[PDB]
Design a protein around this ligand. Structure first.
Ligand SMILES: *[C@@H]1O[C@H](CO)[C@@H](O[C@@H]2O[C@H](CO)[C@@H](O[C@@H]3O[C@H](CO)[C@@H](O)[C@H](O[C@H]4O[C@H](CO)[C@@H](O)[C@H](O)[C@@H]4O)[C@@H]3O)[C@H](O)[C@H]2NC(C)=O)[C@H](O)[C@H]1NC(C)=O
Ligand SMILES: [Ca+2]
Lengths: 100, 862
């Protein structure tokens, strides 16, 4: 049940029960603020899965392809950056599982 | 530049003849017995007391503080040229009535307003008045010159068959030059007649050559000279702290404008126009304000056509790309370095041996699957389609442009075949309406092969630029459509190429999609077809300083979509100059980087790391400000006020802003002073306005005008200020292009006036369609801040647009700690909004309003 845009390595810093921390340290935020489409955190940590941060990244786990951290501005941009297009989910553009 | 390649006033036969006449009693005198006041116009006959050939003067009032008068000849002999397709419509008429009659003068009130025209009879001298105050006098110095159709003779040299350097000009009609002078009392500052590489405020041409308005392909033009550049708009705006007028000299021929001023009592500026042929057609724009003469002129020629949104972004151009592969790698290099690029631009080499409307099967083997992967990454492509058509049996364009006679024809009657880069190139008659209809039909998706909806067209060298021609243009004795010589229809040719290409790009979609076209040569009324850029400029610091005046002067005459080549075109720049040119270019309306063969590759990502992130920040600023650009281009589209405007436009009474051409205003909100010096440690920014606060857009530090502040600068700093009392929208989520940015959350930067007020507008549309007009699918919102309330209303109730854009953040600059911030909406509960107040910069960031831009709302700083 990891938050959108987070790797398994990145999945223990995010806890549903606890308030989310900036993951680098500026201030803490309520978890409802993680992936809320607003840049609450200076690091850009609060929004791994949304394009709300000018400094964040989307981890794309690909089965059969190298996991890649695309820039956050490439999430929901209508272009399928990742091999498994998890980068597009609300943009109206659907991708294919090209992980071959 | 090679100055021994273009005509000075002494080498132009008519210019040295008109200029020879000197101020004195005018031989042209009005006969107030043929004075005939019709329902629309007043007709009088002027007589030349020596020549005894009488001309006809037609005075006409217009419904917008405006007066059009035309001087032609009573018995024409050969009809003279009257410029078509420049006026967007026939101007409405405000009738004239005799307020009084004299044995020597006639005074005529316009409609019922404060304007009266006093017409004297010995000598002829028009005197426009506002109540009892003189505004401008026509033929006040006695320089009205109208060379009639002489009897066939081929005296003075050059008045007939002439040779410039090696090119013959056999004038079959002899001297037909016209001329007229206007004295503006009280005006010392005149602006306009654009495409001259000089300052914004025109200089007095008393001991030098006058300003030439001639569409020429000037190779490596210098600066601060009155030489005619690629375009020509014969509009001259005069400025005073009290009254501002304008003179629109409608003539599509070669024109020289002589600026004069008295030493000395009340100040006065005398402006003399000399045209090679045609009639004397003058529109007089009687203000009384800057915003008024812009609206009047926009009612004459038209408003700046609203561009598509992607054209407001960044365009990248090399001196063509070697194949489809180079385009693919430049797109991938913009994607990999996370730089925002919208359009990739192809030069002449993309054509099949300089043959347009087609692609080489080996250079670009799969043209329409190159645009497919340019549209998958959501970017556009711009080709080159120039007027000259190569000569081939296999060229379908040439085989149809010659079969159907639509080429310009030389003096004998055969087709013009000037040797341009496309082999022997035939130049088509773009004056011909039936040829512009053929031109427009060939941009269709069936005619233009390898064409996609993201493929747009840039018409370079539409002056026309004839390589083996007089100067660099077509011979003046070339016969155009309707029997007109090229001498009559020169300055209108570029406008005709632009119009035909714009209607070609318009009608391929069916009229739905907006057309983006870029032209080098243009005339009055060319704002209605697309963008214009300041030709090919060298990559020096002086050509970057002069970028602003040539776009400020272009914006004054309606062509508010101006820009210069980022990084120059000649003499490849240093990395610092390339950095500073990407910072200025991000705040000009047109933002394109172009290169040459002699220069290397000037892509942003083969620069030093410090010089690449600064440019990346500069592109991010432009894309963030794109909503502001789209709103500003809409204001120029409706009321005609320029996007890039000088400081005296918004502050007419400031006599300090009159000679300012290093700073400009992006509307009423942003004041821009881009840095153009080698290693500049500081800029000197004049912040105008009595009782005005300007906030540094980066540091949020307020300054009280009017003052001259020293702003220390680094390589990373673009000196942009926001005026206190404005609201600037922004897209703070910069993407690869402006195609998903158009549906991204909006943030509003609210700068507070010293009275705690602010006001701004936001224009939204699909950004690529003529749907804001036919179905009114646009959205114009007014954001106001008064007391402690930020309200959002609709500034145009008929604009109903359904957009996914919401307001994600509100930035109030100069506010205080609220201790409570509420959001009220359409009966929904008043949801309290979180906020962060930085006290050092005094900036209040209201977090996630989360409200659609379409809906009305009110944020209360309780
Ligand atoms: C067509 O022309 C008419 C007539 O010229 C023109 O209407 C005029 O508009 C001007 C500008 O609005 C008016 O001038 C104003 O007069 C009032 C009353 O005397 C003054 O208070 C105004 O002063 C303002 O300007 C100051 C400048 O420093 C500012 O500090 C402050 O704003 C002042 O309040 C100003 O002088 C003029 O009275 C009218 N005249 C008539 C007869 O209506 C009209 O706008 C033009 N329309 C078009 C279509 O171009
Ligand atoms: Ca994507």
């Amino acid at each position: 049940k990891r938050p959108r845009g987070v790797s398994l390595t990145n999945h223990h810093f995010y806890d549903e029960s606890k308030p989310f921390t900036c993951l680098d340290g500026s201030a803490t935020i309520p978890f409802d603020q993680v992936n809320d489409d607003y840049c609450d955190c200076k690091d850009g940590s609060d929004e791994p899965g949304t394009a709300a941060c000018p400094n964040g990244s989307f981890h794309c786990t690909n089965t059969g392809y190298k996991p890649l951290y695309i820039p956050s501005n490439r999430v929901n941009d209508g272009v399928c950056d990742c091999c498994d297009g998890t980068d597009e989910y609300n943009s109206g553009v659907i991708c294919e599982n090209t992980c071959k | 530049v090679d100055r021994s390649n273009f005509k000075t006033c002494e080498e132009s036969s008519f210019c040295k003849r008109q200029r020879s006449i000197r101020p004195g009693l005018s031989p042209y005198r009005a006969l107030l017995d043929s004075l005939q006041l019709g329902p629309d116009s007043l007709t009088v006959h002027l007589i030349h007391e020596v020549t005894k050939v009488l001309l006809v003067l037609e005075l006409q009032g217009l419904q917008k503080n405006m007066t059009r008068f035309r001087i032609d000849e009573l018995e024409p002999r050969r009809p003279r040229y009257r410029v078509p397709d420049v006026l967007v419509a026939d101007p409405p008429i405000a009738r004239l009535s005799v307020s009084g009659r004299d044995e020597n003068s006639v005074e005529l009130t316009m409609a019922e307003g404060p304007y009266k025209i006093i017409l004297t009879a010995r000598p002829f001298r028009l005197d426009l008045l506002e109540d009892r105050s003189l505004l401008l006098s026509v033929n006040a110095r006695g320089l009205l010159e109208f060379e009639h159709q002489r009897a066939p003779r081929v005296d003075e040299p050059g008045a007939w068959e002439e040779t410039f350097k090696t090119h013959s000009d056999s004038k079959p009609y002899g001297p037909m030059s016209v001329g007229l002078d206007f004295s503006l009392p009280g005006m010392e500052h005149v602006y306009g007649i654009p495409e001259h590489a000089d300052n914004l405020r025109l200089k007095v041409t008393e001991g030098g050559e006058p300003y030439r308005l001639y569409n020429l392909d000037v190779f490596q033009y210098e600066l601060y000279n009155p030489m005619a550049l690629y375009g020509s708009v014969p509009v001259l705006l005069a400025h005073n702290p009290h009254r501002d007028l304008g003179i629109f000299w409608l003539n599509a021929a070669e024109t020289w404008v002589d600026i004069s001023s008295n030493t000395g009592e009340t100040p006065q500026t005398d402006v003399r126009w000399m045209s090679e042929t045609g009639i004397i057609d003058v529109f007089l724009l009687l203000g009384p304000s800057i915003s008024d003469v812009f609206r009047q002129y926009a009612s004459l020629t038209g408003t700046q056509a609203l561009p598509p949104l992607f054209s407001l972004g960044y365009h990248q151009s090399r001196w063509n790309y070697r194949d489809e592969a180079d385009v693919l790698e430049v797109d991938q290099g913009f994607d990999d370095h996370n730089l925002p690029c919208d359009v990739i631009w192809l030069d002449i080499e993309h054509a099949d041996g300089k043959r347009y409307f087609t692609w080489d099967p080996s250079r670009f083997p799969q043209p329409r699957t190159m645009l497919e992967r340019l549209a998958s990454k959501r970017r556009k492509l711009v080709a080159i389609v120039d007027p000259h058509i190569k000569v081939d049996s296999g060229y379908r364009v040439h085989e149809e442009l010659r079969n159907l006679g639509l080429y310009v024809k030389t003096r004998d009657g055969s087709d013009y075949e000037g040797w341009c880069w496309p082999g022997s190139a035939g130049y088509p008659d773009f004056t011909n309406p039936t040829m512009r209809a053929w031109w427009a039909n060939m941009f269709s998706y069936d005619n233009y092969e390898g064409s996609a909806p993201n493929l747009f067209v840039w018409n370079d060298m539409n002056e026309p630029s004839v390589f083996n021609g007089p100067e660099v243009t077509m011979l003046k004795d070339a016969q155009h459509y309707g029997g007109w010589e090229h001498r009559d229809v020169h300055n209108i040719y570029g406008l005709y190429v632009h119009m035909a290409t714009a209607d070609g790009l318009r009608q391929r979609s069916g009229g739905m999609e907006r057309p983006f076209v870029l032209a080098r040569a243009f005339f009055a009324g060319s704002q209605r077809f697309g963008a214009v850029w300041t030709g090919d400029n060298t990559a020096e610091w002086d050509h970057l300083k002069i970028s602003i005046p040539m776009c400020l002067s272009l914006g004054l005459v309606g062509l508010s979509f101006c820009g210069a080549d980022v990084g120059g075109f000649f003499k490849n720049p240093e990395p610092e100059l390339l950095v500073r040119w990407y910072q200025m270019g991000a705040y000009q309306p047109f933002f394109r980087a172009h290169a040459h063969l002699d220069t290397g590759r000037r892509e942003p990502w083969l620069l030093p790391s410090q010089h690449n992130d600064i440019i990346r920040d500069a592109l991010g600023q432009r894309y963030s400000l794109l909503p502001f650009w789209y709103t500003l281009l809409y204001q120029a589209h409706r009321e005609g006020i320029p996007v890039m405007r000088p400081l005296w436009v918004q502050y007419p009474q400031d006599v300090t802003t009159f000679n300012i051409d290093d700073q400009y205003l992006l509307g009423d909100a942003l004041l821009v002073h881009p840095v153009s010096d080698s290693g500049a440690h500081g800029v000197q920014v004049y912040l105008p306005g009595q009782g005005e606060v300007w906030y540094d857009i980066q540091s949020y530090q307020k300054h009280h005008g009017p003052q001259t502040l020293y702003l220390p600068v680094t390589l990373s700093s673009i000196p942009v200020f926001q005026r206190g009392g404005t609201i600037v929208p922004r897209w703070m989520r910069v993407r690869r292009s402006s195609e998903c940015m158009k549906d991204d959350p909006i943030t509003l930067f609210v700068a507070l006036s010293p009275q705690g007020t602010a006001q701004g507008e936001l224009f939204l549309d699909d950004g690529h369609t003529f749907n804001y007009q036919t179905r009114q699918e646009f959205l114009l919102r007014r954001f106001s801040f008064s007391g402690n309330t930020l309200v959002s209303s609709s500034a145009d109730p008929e604009g109903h647009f359904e957009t996914p854009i919401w307001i994600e953040r509100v930035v109030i600059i100069g506010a205080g700690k609220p201790a409570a911030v509420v959001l009220q909406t359409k009966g929904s509960p008043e949801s309290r909004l979180s906020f962060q107040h930085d006290p050092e910069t005094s900036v209040l960031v209201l977090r996630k309003p989360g409200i659609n831009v379409a809906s009305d709302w009110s944020i209360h700083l309780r």
